[PDB]
RNA sequence: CAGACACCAUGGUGCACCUGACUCCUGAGG
RNA sequence: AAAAAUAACAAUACAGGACUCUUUCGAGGCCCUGUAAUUGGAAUGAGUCCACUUUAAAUCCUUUAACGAGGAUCCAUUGGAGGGCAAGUCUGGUCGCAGCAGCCGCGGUAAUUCCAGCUCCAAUAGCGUAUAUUAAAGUUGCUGCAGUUAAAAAGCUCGUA
């Protein structure tokens, strides 16, 4: 049908200081690679351009009003932006970090069963949590406000309760085959 | 180990007033448009949060009577991140000496650069209020203000100057020779300073003029001479 | 240079001129004013309270300044034999 | 110029032989290696020792 | 500057720009199809040929070396071209009538290095990759 | 200003080179 | 084009810093990052697989009894590290040879450009290369070019479109 890239490649391939900056973001927020950072760079740039367009439209104009409100509402739903600010001027001031902080991984750190921004990502990818009664396997995700009230253990990781898989049973048989000697 | 030292020697009214603290900032001096010929004045009012960046260390030369001769030409730029910047060029026999002199020269030349906005008016200046252009040798750099979160879109050498200038958001276009770096920095230096030289309608409102600090402090500044 | 309703941006407010209506910028050379003393008149003997005129680089290099000062001084007073 | 005669080929390779160090450890995969660079450089040993120094510099 | 700018002068600007466009060397060669006619790349990107002969080339100064090229007649284009053989001691694996995949160099349409009349480089010998032979990932099958 | 004023050609090459942190450390005393 | 695995967490052995004690040295101290020695639980599908599901009938997915990680492994790559250009004032080998080299230039014996090894860098299930076209390019200049001398005002005037 139709497809599109979710990331962007900048015009200078080596730019040492920037490469370091990008590595630091990866460290802080537990990411896979530069493509993860580029993924946010693509989204953020489009949001700023959206904002900037609206801001140069005439005031009290249906298009500016309707799409303004929509852009604001979306950014507040995911908890990047706060609605005590709530106009175009403030949206421009947002940066890469503000998005990353509202991801599933960084919530799984902040509460629950991760010990690091390391651990968290591996926990999500190995299906140790449900967000509600719904497993989430994607760490780069961005949870909404009231979805951070339902992050909890899964019933398909058998610690935190759940049906025995073959990893709990593996540990059982280090006591009944490792120490059972058979 | 090694450690610095500082000493004040006045040869002028301005040096004495600064140390006595009848002048508390460079801004007063800039307003009156009086020269600064003592590095100590800049050191005393600031002397912290002053970053010196050597832009290039490039040698040049002239031919002496018997064989060659060569010397080092250094470009140093200085500035706080609060809207004050300087540029100083010095040429000396060795690399180290050329940079050492260049730093002193850079401090002396320190000039205010006006900071303004793209269109905003709340949340404090992030760019310039007017597009300013500067030319050096047929290189022309044009600075254009940019809105927040855009960042500085410039070549590395102008970007560093803009950073110190307090312009965190800027569009640039530079046209002309791109092989030459001393010219490129100089042209950007001309541009940033030009923001004060523009008369905006927010700057129209007029003032009754200084009575000069030389005249007013005349009695004070008898120490053994006025 | 104000922002908003009258918030202060700005590093300082520069001097202006009235001999060509152009600002004295930012550290420029050949930029100085000119304090003429007032005399109280009638009993003579200087009393304060300076009259100050602001002279810019521009006017001086274009050799205007001599005439300008007289126009400025006369228009607002006061010197004997006008 | 134009010429016609090949002479000597693989002269340097005819007297240089390769060898191998094998592994104490694997060269690290994806995400783990990317994280490892940031920790090894910065959070260790928080940098306070030395200056002006490369990751492979003999300077 | 030096152009017309009235209120009806659209036609004059439109045609004047078109007329002057042709002067530029980069433009002209491509638009007159010269690039295809003279050089075998332009209208192709890669081309396979049969090896005519192996040439030793006593490289023109500066730089003192025997550069060592092959001469290839491309099947598709039908043009005889001398192409550089890169990689160290890799001349060897070429044989007369054994094919090679040839590709352009990097200047595009013009000679490279210190050697004139060569503006192309070999990429595969025996259609199985010179690179793979040099590394020793793959063996010469022929 | 205002005395005299002529033939004469030819000839080759490389390395000029780039960063900041004051001790002989005093070493009876210290 | 999309998602982003190939391990994560403690312990100890160390290299480290806020905190405390001590005049300091030194020691304790939490957070850990790496590097040993191996581990300890604790986890997961890549494979494997009853069953349920899919579907025209099937396949695969999404669903799951029973299995599947202590390590040089269930074991990632492709180019670069003289300049532009990120990363070797590398070690051995060669010595204007073989090669390198878009371009600038290296190599003629103490080669930081080669050829291998080692280390490091960049991007990372992708990366290199060739080529067309686009951007950068105000090097086609409408917005927005240049023409005294750098490439460029017709010998001059009349004059219609």
UniProtKB/Swiss-Prot annotation, chain A:
GO terms for biological process: ribosomal small subunit biogenesis; translation. One of its GO terms (cellular component) is nucleolus. The modification N6-acetyllysine is found at residues 60, 110, 149. Keywords: Acetylation, Cytoplasm, Isopeptide bond, Nucleus, Phosphoprotein, Ribonucleoprotein, Ribosomal protein, RNA-binding, rRNA-binding, Ubl conjugation. It is found in: Cytoplasm; Nucleus, Nucleolus. The modification Phosphoserine is found at residues 147, 157. The keyword Ribonucleoprotein applies. GO terms for molecular function: rRNA binding; structural constituent of ribosome. It comes from the Eukaryota. Residues 102-176 form the S4 RNA-binding domain. Residues 156-182 are annotated as: Disordered. There is a cross-link at residues 87, 133 (Glycyl lysine isopeptide (Lys-Gly) (interchain with G-Cter in SUMO2)). Component of the small ribosomal subunit. Identified in a IGF2BP1-dependent mRNP granule complex containing untranslated mRNAs. Part of the small subunit (SSU) processome, composed of more than 70 proteins and the RNA chaperone small nucleolar RNA (snoRNA) U3. Component of the small ribosomal subunit. The ribosome is a large ribonucleoprotein complex responsible for the synthesis of proteins in the cell. Part of the small subunit (SSU) processome, first precursor of the small eukaryotic ribosomal subunit. During the assembly of the SSU processome in the nucleolus, many ribosome biogenesis factors, an RNA chaperone and ribosomal proteins associate with the nascent pre-rRNA and work in concert to generate RNA folding, modifications, rearrangements and cleavage as well as targeted degradation of pre-ribosomal RNA by the RNA exosome. This is Small ribosomal subunit protein uS4. It comes from Oryctolagus cuniculus.
Swiss-Prot record, chain C:
One of its GO terms (cellular component) is rough endoplasmic reticulum. PROSITE patterns: RIBOSOMAL_S21E. GO terms for biological process: translation. Gene3D superfamilies: 3.30.1230.20. It is found in: Cytoplasm, Cytosol; Cytoplasm; Rough endoplasmic reticulum. There is a cross-link at residue 41 (Glycyl lysine isopeptide (Lys-Gly) (interchain with G-Cter in SUMO2)). The modification N-acetylmethionine is found at residue 1. Pfam families: Ribosomal_S21e. InterPro entries: Ribosomal_eS21, Ribosomal_eS21_CS, Ribosomal_eS21_sf. It comes from the Eukaryota. The keyword Endoplasmic reticulum applies. One of its GO terms (molecular function) is structural constituent of ribosome. Keywords: Acetylation, Cytoplasm, Endoplasmic reticulum, Isopeptide bond, Ribonucleoprotein, Ribosomal protein, Ubl conjugation. The keyword Ubl conjugation applies. Component of the small ribosomal subunit. The ribosome is a large ribonucleoprotein complex responsible for the synthesis of proteins in the cell. Component of the 40S small ribosomal subunit. Belongs to the eukaryotic ribosomal protein eS21 family. This is Small ribosomal subunit protein eS21. It comes from Oryctolagus cuniculus (Rabbit).
Swiss-Prot record, chain D:
It comes from the Eukaryota. It is found in: Cytoplasm; Nucleus. The modification N6-succinyllysine is found at residue 51. Coiled coil: none annotated. Component of the 40S subunit of the ribosome. Contributes to the assembly and function of 40S ribosomal subunits. Component of the 40S subunit of the ribosome. This is Small ribosomal subunit protein eS30. The chain holds residues 75 to 133 of 133 of the full protein.
């Amino acid at each position: 049908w139709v497809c599109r890239k979710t990331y962007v490649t900048p015009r200078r391939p080596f730019e040492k200081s920037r490469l370091d900056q990008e590595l630091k973001l990866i460290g802080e927020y537990g990411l896979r690679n530069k493509r993860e950072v580029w993924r946010v760079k693509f989204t953020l740039a489009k949001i700023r351009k959206a904002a900037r367009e609206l801001l140069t439209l005439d005031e009290k104009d249906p298009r500016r009003l309707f799409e303004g409100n929509a852009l604001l509402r979306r950014l507040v739903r995911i908890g990047v932006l706060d609605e005590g600010k709530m106009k175009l001027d403030y949206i421009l001031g947002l940066k890469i970090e503000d998005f990353l902080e509202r991801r599933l991984q960084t919530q799984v750190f902040k509460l629950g069963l991760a010990k690091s921004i390391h651990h968290a990502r591996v926990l999500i990818r190995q299906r140790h949590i449900r967000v509600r009664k719904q497993v989430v396997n994607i760490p780069s995700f961005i949870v909404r406000l009231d979805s951070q009230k339902h992050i909890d253990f899964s019933l398909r990781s058998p610690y935190g309760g759940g049906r025995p898989g073959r990893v709990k049973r593996k540990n059982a048989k280090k006591g009944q085959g490792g120490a059972g000697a058979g | 180990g090694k450690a610095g030292d500082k000493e004040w020697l006045p040869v002028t009214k301005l040096g004495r007033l600064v140390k006595d603290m009848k002048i508390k900032s460079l801004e007063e001096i800039y307003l009156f448009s009086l020269p600064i010929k003592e590095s100590e004045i800049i050191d005393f009012f600031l002397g912290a949060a002053l970053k010196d960046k050597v832009l290039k260390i490039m040698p040049v030369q002239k031919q002496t009577q018997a064989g060659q001769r060569t010397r080092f030409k250094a470009f140093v730029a200085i500035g706080d991140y609060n809207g004050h910047v300087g540029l100083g060029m010095k040429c000396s026999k060795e690399v180290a000496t050329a940079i050492r002199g260049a730093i002193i020269l850079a401090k002396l030349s320190i000039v205010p650069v006006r900071r303004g906005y793209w269109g905003n008016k709340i949340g404090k200046p992030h760019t310039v209020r007017c597009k300013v252009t500067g030319r050096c040798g047929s290189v022309l750099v044009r600075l254009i203000p940019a809105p927040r979160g855009t960042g500085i879109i410039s070549a590395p050498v102008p970007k560093k100057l803009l950073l110190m200038a307090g312009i965190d958001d800027c569009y640039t276009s530079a046209g002309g020779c791109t092989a030459t770096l001393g010219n490129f920095a100089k042209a950007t230096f001309d541009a940033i300073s030009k923001t004060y030289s523009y008369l905006t309608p927010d700057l129209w409102k007029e003032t009754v003029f200084t009575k000069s600090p030389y005249q007013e402090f005349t009695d004070h500044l008898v120490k053994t001479h006025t | 240079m104000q922002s908003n309703a009258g918030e202060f941006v700005d590093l300082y407010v520069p001097r202006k001129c009235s001999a060509s209506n152009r600002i004295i910028g930012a550290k420029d050379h050949a930029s100085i004013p000119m304090n003429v003393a007032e005399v109280d008149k009638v009993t003579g003997r200087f009393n304060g309270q300076s009259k100050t005129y602001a002279i810019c680089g521009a006017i001086r290099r274009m050799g205007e300044s001599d005439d300008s000062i007289l126009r400025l001084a006369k228009s607002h007073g006061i010197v004997s034999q006008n | 110029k134009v010429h016609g005669s090949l002479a000597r080929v693989g002269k340097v390779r005819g007297q240089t032989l390769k060898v191998a160090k094998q592994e104490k450890k694997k060269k690290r995969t994806g995400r783990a290696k990317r994280r490892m660079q940031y920790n090894r450089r910065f959070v260790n040993v928080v940098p306070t020792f030395g200056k002006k120094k490369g990751p492979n510099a003999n300077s | 500057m030096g152009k017309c700018r009235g209120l009806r002068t659209a036609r004059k600007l439109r045609s004047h720009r078109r007329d002057q466009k042709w002067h530029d060397k980069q433009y002209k060669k491509a638009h007159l199809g010269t690039a295809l006619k003279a050089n075998p790349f332009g209208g192709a990107s890669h081309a396979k040929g049969i090896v005519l002969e192996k040439v030793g080339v006593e490289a023109k100064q500066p730089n003192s070396a025997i550069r060592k090229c092959v001469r290839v007649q491309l099947i598709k284009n039908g043009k005889k071209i001398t192409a550089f053989v890169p990689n160290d001691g890799c001349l060897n694996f070429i044989e007369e009538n054994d094919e090679v995949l040839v590709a352009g160099f990097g200047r595009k349409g013009h000679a490279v290095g210190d050697i004139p009349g060569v503006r192309f480089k070999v990429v595969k010998v025996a259609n199985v990759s010179l690179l793979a032979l040099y590394k020793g990932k793959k063996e010469r099958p022929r």
